[PDB]
Design a protein around this nucleic acid. Structure first.
Length: 302
RNA sequence: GGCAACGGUUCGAUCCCGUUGC
């Protein structure tokens, strides 16, 4: 009975995202597990973990929006754009309040971004950071990201704190390093927390220690860790919740499950959709409307 | 299932996802 679902963990600081994933994977004794977007060791926040069948639809989160809380240290520039690196430049913070508003505004809307060499973006088979750590630079191509909202939380001393909502693949890290140059002093990130991923309730987040407490509480009360861990998970189809659902009668789905496109009533004129079966409205996987208007299976649950 | 190339995701994912080849 492999476990399937989504766990909204709150990543501990100074831990790599893969490490958090493995510990969660082991804790739930799940055969398969993947995360839907990384968080740097320094950062903390929401890191969705897809378990079992859920890993199948992880691309949808991977591509959704994320909201962050970040504090930057003005006057200093690091080689990795964050506190976890060596300082390469240190200059006086001398920008006027109005110079700070103009800048914060240049990063609003649709913009192009050249990510840090210290990232997992792939170049010729290797991770960019691999070249970095070896003291090598490679040409990068500006990527198009979207800043939905930028919030000026404050500005005290050498600190500037903001909260931003952005599209997938956004390196707030780079905005700070970029902004640091616009202002004239330099700037690296010292605090980073992902508040949300897509329309996910921060109220469902749980910390690694909290999971470890439930496990402990389980042996103690002599009950299966599952009876406590399982309820913390979101449904496996949640990653595709952003799509229209469609139900098929047991009769129409037996064909669907054999890779056969089928016809139904309330079937969208195009795009992806979640497919469910008769009564319970049980989820059986992702479909897509083809040229003939039928609902063609694309990825199914075993 | 698997193996390989390449890409994705905010950096120490071989491990998760996708394209392609076998």
């Amino acid at each position: 009975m492999d476990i399937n679902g989504v766990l909204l963990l709150d990543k501990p600081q100074g831990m790599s995202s893969n490490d958090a994933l493995q510990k969660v994977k082991r804790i739930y004794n799940a055969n398969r597990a993947g995360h839907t977007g990384a968080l740097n060791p320094l950062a903390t926040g929401m890191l969705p973990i897809c378990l079992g069948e859920a890993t199948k639809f992880s691309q949808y989160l991977l591509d959704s929006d994320k909201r962050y809380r970040v504090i930057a240290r003005l006057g200093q520039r690091t080689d990795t754009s964050d506190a976890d690196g060596q300082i390469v430049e240190e200059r006086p913070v001398t920008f006027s309040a109005e110079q700070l508003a103009a800048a914060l505004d240049t990063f609003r809307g649709d913009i192009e971004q050249i990510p840090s060499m210290y990232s997992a973006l792939k170049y010729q088979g290797k991770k960019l950071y691999e070249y970095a750590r070896q003291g090598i630079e490679v040409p990068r191509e500006a990527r198009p990201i979207t800043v939905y909202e930028l919030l000026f939380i404050r500005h005290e001393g050498n600190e500037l704190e903001l909260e931003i909502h952005c599209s997938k693949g956004t390196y707030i890290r780079t905005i700070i390093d970029d902004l640091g140059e616009k202002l004239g002093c330099g700037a690296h990130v010292i605090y980073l927390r992902r508040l949300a991923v897509s329309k996910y309730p921060v109220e469902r987040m749980v910390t690694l220690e909290h999971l470890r407490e439930l496990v402990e509480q389980a042996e103690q009360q002599d009950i299966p860790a599952a009876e406590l861990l399982d309820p913390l998970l979101m449904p496996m189809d949640s990653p595709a919740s952003d799509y229209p659902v469609v139900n098929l009668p047991l009769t129409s789905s037996v064909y669907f499950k054999n890779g056969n496109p089928v016809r139904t009533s309330g079937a969208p004129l195009e795009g992806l959709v979640r497919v469910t079966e008769g009564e319970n409205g049980k989820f059986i996987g992702m479909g897509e409307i083809d040229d003939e208007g039928r609902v063609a299976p694309r990825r199914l649950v075993v």
